[model samples]
Target: IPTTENLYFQGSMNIFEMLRIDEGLRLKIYKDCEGYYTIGIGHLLTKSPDLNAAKSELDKAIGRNCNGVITKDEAEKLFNQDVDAAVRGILRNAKLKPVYDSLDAVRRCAAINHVFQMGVTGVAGFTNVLRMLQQKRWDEAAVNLAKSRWYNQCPDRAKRVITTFRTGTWDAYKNL
Candidate 1:
């Protein structure tokens, strides 16, 4: 187990908020920001239901057709499971794990949050940011993160991640 200090508490909470901002919740199936058929938080049907086979089983249980549905409780459970898995995956990644482990809790969460939002493959594509992270140049990493399409797309989300990453604060939602 990772030490308590290395936990994802603040980062994950911010991510859940960001999900609410970007994904919004739904008890019934609907299209997401990118128009992929989504349900419950940000569960994208187009991404293969592998994130939680049990959720899909529930989908079958509810007799939903192509338009799948999940209760609020189910959505919360799946969100916890998915976020936990995403954090663990980011920490375990071969290319990024070293830098991830070397970071402070806030910084580590920022890294994993990006991974959670974009997938490790997409995070890997941020070459400059990764390089900055690998070298322990945290501010530069945050700066590089801002210079991307991800930042351009969601400046609000980027503010939480970047500000937390730079100042090591869990108060990303204080002003707004």
Candidate 2:
């Protein structure tokens, strides 16, 4: 949205590229890097997924102030985490193997899309639902579930996490 001109056109393409990765990073997209609120918000988001992309995004974002260069890469990385979590959760449910599957991370996009018209919303809700469980924050996950717009469909995705953790094997070739 920091325009060379209009915001939407440039933003949309970058989003598409970010989603293409299997698992990268998860960082918040903030309006200001130097603002106090930005660090705290970025912390919550960064720690959640805490992946490579998160680190890169944060690094680039903090550096954005001195140099007005915002890479398309940052946009893609920042937006894909929730969707990644959503897809990973769903693949876990189907008793399918994500570790070895070649579709890469695209499975999540399909699963998230399968759930709703608002892809990002579905992904966001599911990401929280799944991560809270992984972090053993069952109470938060429960609350997230209740508040989630897709709570009705979230159980299946969640089951994937529970099953994988409890079962103790990724079974790289389950559906194959």
Candidate 3:
């Protein structure tokens, strides 16, 4: 559940579940589609704060010679951190902030999930979709989303997100 004043709690949980299905949990580090060293729920270890911090933390927590494997708990921690970063990035955007703030918890979760996959700048490219969302034109916004390259790349995930956007509800993803 989430209060009107703090939708992030529920939104975060929803995102975790969504990513669990979309990204799948991996205990060992592996190269992503782009050849970046990724671990946990999709934490890119090659860049962002450098590999040193992540490597040092992993070594300290699990000790050396553990291969590249991490515990489920550690993976959850990294997922939470990644979710937080995505949410913060979305909120920090001047144009997206108010639109995100105006959405309900379900829609907020959808927004976070979208940004988690695409990055804020990438999502910001959907200028018309953002405007439709801001105006509460849910169906129109969803229509725009359905036509995007993001949708083409991951139609299953994008369909769920588009349904949430169209209905302002999580019914599309609730079974997950």
lDDT of each model, Cα atoms only?
A: 0.66, 0.38, 0.77
Worst 10 residues of 2 by lDDT: 35-44
For residues 5-74, could you state the per-residue lDDT of candidate 3 as single tens digits?
4444345457778767666778887656545566778666654345555566556545565457888888
RMSD (CA, Å), each prediction: 6.8, 15.3, 6.1
- What is the per-residue lDDT of model 1 for residues 2-88, given as tens digits with 9 covering 90 to 100? 458545545455656654544567887665444455667665555443435434654654455433566788777766766787788
1 against 2, candidate with superior lDDT: 1
Candidate 3: C-alpha lDDT:
0.77
Error of 3 at 82 (Å): 0.5
Name the weakest run of 10 consecutive residues (lDDT summed) in model 3: 5-14
Off by over 4 Å in 3: 1-13, 30-37, 45-66
**What's the residue-level lDDT of 102 in candidate 3?**
89
lDDT of model 2 at position 26: 32
Indicate the worst ten consecutive residues by lDDT in candidate 1.
46-55
